[PDB]
Amino acid sequence: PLRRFFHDILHTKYRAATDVYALMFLADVVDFIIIIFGFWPEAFLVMLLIQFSTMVVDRALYLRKTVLGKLAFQVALVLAIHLWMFFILPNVVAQLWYFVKCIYFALSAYQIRCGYPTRILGNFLTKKYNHLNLFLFQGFRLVPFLVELRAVMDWVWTDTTLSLSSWMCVEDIYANIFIIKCSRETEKKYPQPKGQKKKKIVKYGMGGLIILF
Amino acid sequence: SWMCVEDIYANIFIIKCSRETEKKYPQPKGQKKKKIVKYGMGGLIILFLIAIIWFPLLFMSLVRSVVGVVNQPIDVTVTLKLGGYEPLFTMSAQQPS
Amino acid sequence: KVSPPSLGFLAGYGIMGLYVSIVLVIGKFVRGFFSEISHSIMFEELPCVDRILKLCQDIFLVRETRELELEEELYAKLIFLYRSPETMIKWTREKE
Amino acid sequence: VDRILKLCQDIFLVRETRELELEEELYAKLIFLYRSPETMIKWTREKE
């Protein structure tokens, strides 16, 4: 019966495909933060590395589109966390970490049951050209190291004919063409008359802050 | 101007070297970069980043794994004094006591 | 129990703050390599860099034989190749 | 910046469907736009 069960999940026919990586990742970010903020030490140190390493493996299975690999990662992680945190390690902090990791295991299972789509390549924030998107894109660039690690990781796992120097030059052109596109849009939705002085409030606000700094 | 002629030459040399290697060892058109090259270069970079974040912390915490020393008294001096007057009793319980 | 550490220079919340600051600085340094690498594509993706190597090596020959009038005239060619992005796409093309 | 956004998004489509010969030929267009300052003033003009 075990063989039959597994077969089903891996080769069925009722698989409407969806992409829940964006969110599986947000849960992992939130977890990271809990561990760090509530550090109240070898325990914290080891756990931080663990969370980081799970995130890397997750990206790999997304970009390589493997459902069998995700099944195995789920089995392993479920058992491991349920043992480590309930026998070895031993608290509101750890009570949360658990709730948020439970949401990760749920969303992951949805993906192993639904299957990966066809188009998995393309940023999450660069789909709509508004103002929220611009500010989130720019913010993600500010976190130290995120932009770089994404680029290298995507290179190793996606099949490309280019090197790393050239991969990273295509990714830079795209980031900057996006930011210009967002600004061009805002200035078409909210135009400004020709020959109109910039309002005093804007000036005194921006300038004021800089001077104070 | 001297230093701008010397920079042009350094960079034209490096491009020339790379152009040569890719004529001696050509690569077919439309051939994926081999997995080994990718996993090697990429791997190192990723590792460096982890070792510029976690490892410093780890080493500092390793330093913190030390001990304390049992500083037993050498002498236990005890006095019983009535008011202003000379102590009624004085004793120094040293190492054996 | 008394306590005498040997490497106790790495202590304090000032040391925690120091660590954070180090990360930030190194972070900006790494960004350097991954950020504006599209701004120097005009001067680093040249197809055939052979005709420029001849000009650079002729400035050097002239310096040897001390014919310093031609050092000036050959410096003018090198400076007007790097001042016109479109004459570098003519000088650096693969002549096949 | 719209015609450049189409080239950048077509490099990505080709990577998905694994037709890697066209990834090379579309990288050559992007690199020769950024190597000729005056073909960027033709590609990036407001077509009104």
Binding site: - | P26 | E94 | Y27, L33, T39
Partner: peptide, 16 residues
């Protein structure tokens, strides 16, 4: 060859 395809763009592609 890969490096003769990467380094072969001209002004005719960016035409009409």
């Amino acid at each position: 060859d890969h490096a003769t395809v990467i380094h072969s763009g001209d002004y005719f592609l960016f035409e009409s």
